[PDB]
Every structure is written in C-alpha cells, then in structure tokens.
Amino acid sequence: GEEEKEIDKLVELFAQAYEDAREKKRNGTPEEWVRDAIEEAARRVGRSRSRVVEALRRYAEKHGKEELLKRAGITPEALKVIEKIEKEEGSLEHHHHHH
C-alpha cells in the first residue's frame, strides 16, 4: 500500500546495478560492486548517492539484513561491507579542514 514507498524500490534498482557492476568488474571487489550500484540506483531517480544509502540501510534495519541481502541478490559477506562504505564516506576523522 503506502509502506516503504521510497525505501523498497531503492533496493530493487540497487540489485540489478550490483549485478551490472559485478559483471563489468569480474576481477573487482564486493565494495566496488556496491559502490557503483549505489551510484546507478541514485542516477535512476535523479537523487544523491547518499540518500539511497539511508534507504538500503533503513530497509536492513526494518526487514533485517537477511532480507536485504536476498532483495539485493548479494551475500551477507557483501552486505556487511556496505556499512564500511557508509563509514568511508564519513571520513571526517581521516582529513583536516578549517571550521
């Protein structure tokens, strides 16, 4: 009905984008395949690459990680790394700037 209207569909396009990334980067990593999938999932709707992260990550908190990995067509060994991609975008501790 009206539940997960902007969340569940944000995992659907991420699934096929992760497949496309794994097929073009055969010698790559699960982190590169999620990283490229998050971009194409955002590009599909015209959003930022950050808003889609909150969506696939919310979905795993609401449905559980075991449901997210099935919906995205990924392994739990790949799903656990998506949290490290979120923290790698959060690299304010690794850099210096004026404030």
What residues contact 66, with CB distance under 8 A and at least 6 apart?
A: 76
The answer to whether the beta carbons of residues 56 and 68 sit under 8 Å apart is yes
Give the count of beta carbons closer than 10 Å to the beta carbon of residue 85.
Answer: 16
| 3-state class (DSSP) for residue 95 | coil
Q: Are 47 and 89 in contact (CB under 8 A)?
A: no
Q: Are 49 and 37 in contact (CB under 8 A)?
A: no
Q: How is residue 41 written in tokens?
A: 């999932």
Torsion of CA 47, 78, 33, 44, to 10 degrees: -20
Question: Whole-angstrom Cα distance, residue 95 to residue 31?
Answer: 21
- Cβ(54)–Cβ(42) below 8 Å: no
Q: Between the CA atoms of 43, 48, 49 and 54, what dihedral angle is there, to the nearest 10 degrees? A: -120
DSSP code for 45: T
